[PDB]
RNA sequence: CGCGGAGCCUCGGUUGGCCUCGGAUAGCCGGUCCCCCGCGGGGUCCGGUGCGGAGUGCCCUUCGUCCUGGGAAACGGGGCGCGGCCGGAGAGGCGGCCGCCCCCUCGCCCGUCACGCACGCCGUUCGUGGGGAACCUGGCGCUAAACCAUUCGUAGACGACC
RNA sequence: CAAGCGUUCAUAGCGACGUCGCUUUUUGAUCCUUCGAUGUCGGCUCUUCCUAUCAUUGUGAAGCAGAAUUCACCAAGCGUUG
RNA sequence: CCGCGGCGGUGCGCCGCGACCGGCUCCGGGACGGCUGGGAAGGCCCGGCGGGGAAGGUGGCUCGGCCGAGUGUUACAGCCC
């Protein structure tokens, strides 16, 4: 797996019918992914750790988007997490502030990322929960959370710092 | 009684790093730091003009001391309004980090 | 000390990007560098949008922490943006930028003129204002 | 994890009146006028309070380094005031077995002049800085006192002269020797 | 742009000034860096004292009047770095250091010019502000310069000179104002063309 | 020094911009009624600007020629026009400011006519009295030193040096 | 890491059973270069560099009272002889 | 010879133009299909049913000229969600 910004490429399917069992069950993984190409076989690598189903033995019935109910709308998004340290393979609550349940892991991997030069293809989501304003833990988001909330934008550096490449005026940042 | 031939300076000839092709120079025209910006340079004719020497004829004129290699721009080169330019005949060398001179007369507008 | 106190509902003009030159009400703030913004009589959608690419204004207005649309559409309406700005001293020096750059050949030619006279008729009145400040100093 | 914000108030007193040079704050009261710069630091120094009640130091953008420095800047701003209501006293008490250090101020403050520590025949010259009045007390033995408006000069100077007497090629377990501060104080106490 | 440049050191940073110099010099342009004590730079004051340091070790030690010139003067010093981003072994690198002209304090003709800033390079922008550092002026001294001193108290002969001229010049807009005022209907249909196509306003 | 006539060559250019200090979780400017200092400087108060409009996103000045016969504008400009007093020294090289002669009347609107209209074509326009190297006019000044040879040694291989 | 010694006490000074490294002033491996042969051991003289600090400057240690002594830091500034 | 009429070759030397075509590299438009027969949004309202932050609120405290401003709490809606 690499990135872009990720997508819920959700998808079901089941391990194809034998003579002896003609209707298996099916099973919707919330993949979660860059396009349909990587989710479709990014089930499979998630279901043939659970399951005993494979990319022969199976099919994907559905794969498609779920693409977000509340877009509009600012959300506290957790998310029991799972990854491969350089020494073990570790478990994470972790809390992104954004609007839309990828964009909210889109970050995640992000982070992974730099606080733990963790890549994608060791990383693995149990599962993102929106989660209410109260059992938030992170204190990081529990503060954009109020309602009289107040910035100024204090030391801020000009870019177009070579519209003029150069100028006479000294440029200035307080504003 | 000005520019017309619009300012530029010829900053060196397409390249790789341990090549180059010297037919397509690199023009770094006056006042265009984008490529989005540098769609009225296509197509124009341009001059690398001196003196040398020996008079020279002059169409309009009496026999003069100035030459010119006497080129047109092809297209824009890399994100910063660079613009790659091929004259009829190659450039001197001699003429890194002088000037060219990018005329309007083959308008588009 | 700042005056400029990213609320729920600083005016900010966007400087830049898809939207440029249009206010937007901030509705709500996101994260550190990410709001959930809103320009409704300006035509930009509730959408996210960076502390970036946003330069804010002395302007508020009170629509509470997410409001839906509507109740932005008024507080915009009713307090008036959109006449209050272009009194401002940014509205009129943008729409002027703007009018240079929209500027045919002709104007230019005339403003040359009209500059060349104006700035005579004013350095006639500065060598006579030097003329009686010498004689004052006399 | 940057924190949104962080400020804090110091109460100031009816006596002084601080006004503030954009981010140099300058304090004066009965005893004098201080002066001190908070360009490094980097926060925002409001004087919210009318008639005039509250200096207020924010901090805002920032990361747990920073978040410390405002409550740093918050005490040398207490440690004004009480340096130009009060004023501050350190006094320092001469230690020996045997050899008497042989103390005598000499210009004002200034010059404190120590023969014989430790029968040593170079006599140990220190400088007070600047708005330091050094001067040998009474109603006590062996003991100085080194008044100013400014702690950071006095406790430097106190300092100076405690480790100019120093012993070497010993045991300072044992020869424990020398002038050292013993009580940090103020010259009015209310 | 056209013509001569001149750049004012002050607030600039070392390196990340001289690559944007540098560029220009061989585009045939004409650069004269100006008062390069002001030049400043990233990391500590000693880091880079220690890091100078280590170069006045680097010395040819058959023998060293051959061996690199460890020029002392901020000027020349920002010329090395200036010219390690030319290729200057080639005739074209030589010609364009020739296009360089860098002092300490600022000159005759060189008081006497505005001047300009490179924003890319400014210190103020291109660092974060909780940063620490080294003015090359006091890093020059402690490596081995004599003139710290001198470039300073000829620099504030010069600003008290210069506020002289920057009084007068604010005399002489004050007067435009004032004569725009006592002006304002035989231009009053002039100024109106100007601010109708966007000039002044 | 001035101002004159030809000609090898070596080139780059093709309006200028004549100025504070610096701050950056701040600045810019006005005005002081008031206060202190040396027309200025410092202070305090208020009033304006501050994604900056006495903004390098900037300002200025013009760019086919002259006619003449209205208005707006009217003492502006010139004669390498001419003397005196400044101020400027970091490696000045430039300003600045005062008499007198002669000459001219120009920026913006307009009438009104004109300029080889070369019959769709290229190095067009200037910084150009460039830089440098060779030669034709007047006035005023000028008026050698260096090296060899010799001598000396304070120095020595010879060279070098006193 | 740490079981001990050190009257007592791990770690002032030490430190077993274990274990992780450098270094190329020891010897080995190896055989990459040279057999139209690069002078093959020591001594003298003479430079310069390193620190893997024996002295000295400034320091922190000690089971340092002094005296004397070892542990360690910056440190290679000048020393290391007949 | 004057035609430079019609045909066939070229250009002395420097050049410029035009319209087809191939290949490219770009740039403007405009129309549709699908999809969880797209999610989301808007406007108009209406009639309902619930929950949280939190009031045109109340209240403890502060700061300013009953009003304006700050914090603290129960939470109904006279805001919003
Ligand atoms: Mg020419
Ligand atoms: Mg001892
Ligand atoms: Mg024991
Ligand atoms: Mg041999
Ligand atoms: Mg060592």
Known sequence: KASGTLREYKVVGRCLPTPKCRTPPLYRMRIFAPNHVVAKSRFWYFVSQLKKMKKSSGEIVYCGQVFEKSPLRVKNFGIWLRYDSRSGTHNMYREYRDLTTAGAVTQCYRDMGARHRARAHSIQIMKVEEIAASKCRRPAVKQFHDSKIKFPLPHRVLRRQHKPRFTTKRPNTFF | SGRLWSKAIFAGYKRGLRNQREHTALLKIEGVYARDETEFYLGKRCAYVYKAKNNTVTPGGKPNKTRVIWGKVTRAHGNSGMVRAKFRSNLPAKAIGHRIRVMLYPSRI | ?????????????????????????????????RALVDGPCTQVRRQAMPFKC??????????????????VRKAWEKADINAKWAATRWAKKIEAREKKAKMTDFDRYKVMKARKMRNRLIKLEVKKLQKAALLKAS | ?????????????????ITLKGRTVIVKG??????????????????????????????????????????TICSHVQNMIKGVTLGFRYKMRSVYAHFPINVVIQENGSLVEIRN??????????????????????AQKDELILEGNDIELVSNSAALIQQATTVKNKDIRKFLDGIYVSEKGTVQQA | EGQVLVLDGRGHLLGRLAAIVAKQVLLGRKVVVVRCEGINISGNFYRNKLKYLAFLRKRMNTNPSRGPYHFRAPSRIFWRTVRGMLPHKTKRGQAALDRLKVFDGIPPPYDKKKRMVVPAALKVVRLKPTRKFAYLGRLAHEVGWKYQAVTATLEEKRKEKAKIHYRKKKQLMRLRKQAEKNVEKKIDRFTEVLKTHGFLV
């Open chain 4, 1 to 17: 994890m940057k924190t949104i914000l962080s400020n804090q108030t110091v109460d100031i007193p009816e006596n002084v009146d």
């Open chain 3, 54 to 71: 946003m330069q804010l204004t002395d302007f508020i207005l009170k629509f509470p922490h997410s409001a839906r649309q509507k109740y």
């Open chain 4, 30 to 71: 009965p005893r004098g006028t201080l002066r001190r710069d908070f360009n490094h630091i980097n926060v925002e120094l409001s004087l919210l309070g009318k008639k005039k009640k509250r200096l207020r130091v924010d901090k805002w953008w920032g990361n747990r380094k920073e978040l410390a420095t405002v409550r």
């Open chain 3, 1 to 33: 000390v700042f005056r400029r106190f990213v609320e729920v509902g600083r005016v900010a003009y966007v400087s830049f990007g898809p939207h440029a030159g249009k206010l937007v009400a901030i509705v709500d703030v996101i994260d550190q560098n």
């Open chain 4, 117 to 138: 520590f430790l029968g040593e025949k170079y006599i140990r010259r220190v400088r007070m800085r600047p708005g330091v009045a050094c001067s040998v007390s009474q």
